[PDB]
Amino acid sequence: GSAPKYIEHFSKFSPSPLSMKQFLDFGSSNACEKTSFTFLRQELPVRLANIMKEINLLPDRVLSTPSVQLVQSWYVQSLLDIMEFLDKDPEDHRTLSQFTDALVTIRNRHNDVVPTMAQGVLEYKDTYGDDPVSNQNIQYFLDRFYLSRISIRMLINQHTLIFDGKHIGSIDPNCNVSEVVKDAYDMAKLLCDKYYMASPDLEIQEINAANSKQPIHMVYVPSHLYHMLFELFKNAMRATVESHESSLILPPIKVMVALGEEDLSIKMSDRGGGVPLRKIERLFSYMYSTAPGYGLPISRLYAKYFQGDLQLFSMEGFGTDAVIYLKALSTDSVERLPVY
Template sequence: MLSSLCSLGTKVIPPVRTGSFALGSARYFNDYSPSKIAAARKEMIRLRRLDQYAITLDHLEQFGRNCDDKKFLLSAQFCYRELPIRLAYRIYDLENMPFGMSNMSTTKTVRDWYIYSLIDMLDFGRPKTYDDAVAFTEVLRNIYDRHSGTMEMMARSVFSVKEEIERSGKMDTELDPIKPALDSFYTSRIGIRILLEQHLSLEEQMRDPIPGYTGIINRNTNPYDVAQLAIDQAQQVCNRQYGQTVPVSIYSHKDRTFSYIPSMLRHILFELLKNSMRATIEQHEFDDELPPIKVVISDGDNNSDIIMKISDEGGGIARKNINRIWDYFYSTSKIQFLGKDGTDFGIDSPMCGLGYGLPLSRLYAQYFGGSLEIVSIEGYGTDAYLYLKKVGDQEEPIQKLLKPSL
């Protein structure tokens, strides 16, 4: 599939070489003059008339397996064909956010990152040779790094809107239109990051192959091993925050595997475990011992899904609040920003973080056909159920944009 799409590249996005480049080992420099931005905006109108191509894990894995120079060039050409379209869609989103979010400096900063990234790719042009693909990959690496602070910047915008709503005396329900807008933006961002990470990883693995891996996809992802890694990392964060941690028990076969993106699974489990650990410590603050968190992994031969349950005795969630846990502006603790250079979630993040853990984890789970559900007993504890498809044939959820009129 990817190879056939790459052949469309010249027709869909003709090469536009209007800038000069200084390519280094890890950075790429361009100027973003008003005339270039104006030209990019004109190109955005055309790009937003084009359809995005939905991919599956199977597409990525099968295409990238045994990557050679030819496949690497095709991968670069696909990124050149697809990413500008997705960036154009997201720029439109950022300029049409509800509650005046689009006018906030933090949102404008993120929007500018997307415009600069679009200019970078269009200026470079469609890679035609392997050497072009190598140079273009440096452009993509710079783009990937540029957007690492997006979560923090957008969280600041949401936090500012929430503060304004609270000052006006309105209810949090007034913020309801923000959720679908952010869901759309972040879902697309996941797809963009996956395409970038997959291509960058293919380049690295051409030099240094990793058994079982095709880019960021591991054909032998072991849920037990990933869960253990997420537990270790969550306990590090918990110990740093509280000076103690919560014991965790895993109930699972240790040799079950499936094809998935381990980093995505680790992120989901890490966020769920952080929530459970914080709730457990705060609920049992004066107890001699902390009740363990239980992680149960079900993977029967006839299961269509990998099912993971995380159970805690952290006091649960009030029924009136259970639906609000998926809101980006709902948090039971004070938001902790990382600073202007804060990156995507990792073990250096604070225990409470941006208040985005659950809604983003659900988007990650849903991206390739899974789901995340929360069941809570107020006064006792919470169960989180994570479902992931065993078969990677689910297309990513590409959201269509209304065709703009001229």
């Protein structure tokens, strides 16, 4: 076929990272659908081909696995589905309506990639071992693969949500961080109450440095923020409950939302007994987090996707702090795409 020819071609192009502003401009009006089509029919093959080229550069012991080949088959099909529109005409509303339908299919085709790539890590550990060099190479590849996957789904979500026929697709220009915190907590609480018959309470404190007592808002993707906060709450609650099983006091989970000139930082503090430093440094490893999971490493990728970060600092015997670092300004919020 021509799949190898198409990967090599678009592999020569570099992905074009977009800013929050550019995302808001693309979603400003439904009339923009044409510019989004002409941009995505070139950008999506470029991002797909770039990661598809790195997949083919993996060692043959990884490249010949059924998991990598299954995912590579999805990417080849997705690439070909998008390349059909390269010659079509943007002015034909059927060309655009078909593109939107083709993106939704591509998105659903890749819905089960995270657990599939997680099966590959487990297969590797049992077929070749869990050495540190394998950890760094798996970590390096998966971080870049998943980050690419986040970027592609972001592009697809922005087009399919806005051009469907206050919120700009998946972006909330006035995202109230404390409200997303509460939502993520309420969901973790429900699960914690169902499993442990007890849940820690929530305390939130905001620190708007420049405008005290003004609610902290930002331009961000609330779904991404929810995912990070939901994973952290699940860990903080699990630790808080299991560490106080022999006690009556169930210490609360405290969340500080701080807004500075550059950073919007969200710290989650628990008293769930803490974790030795030796293990904290392994909670972000795909291989060590795999067992016969990836919430934290992927959560950190969501934070990094827009020039943020996610860091953990524990105190064995007391508790653990988790901090989501985000860019406070939409001008500094730019896609972090893997460097190919």
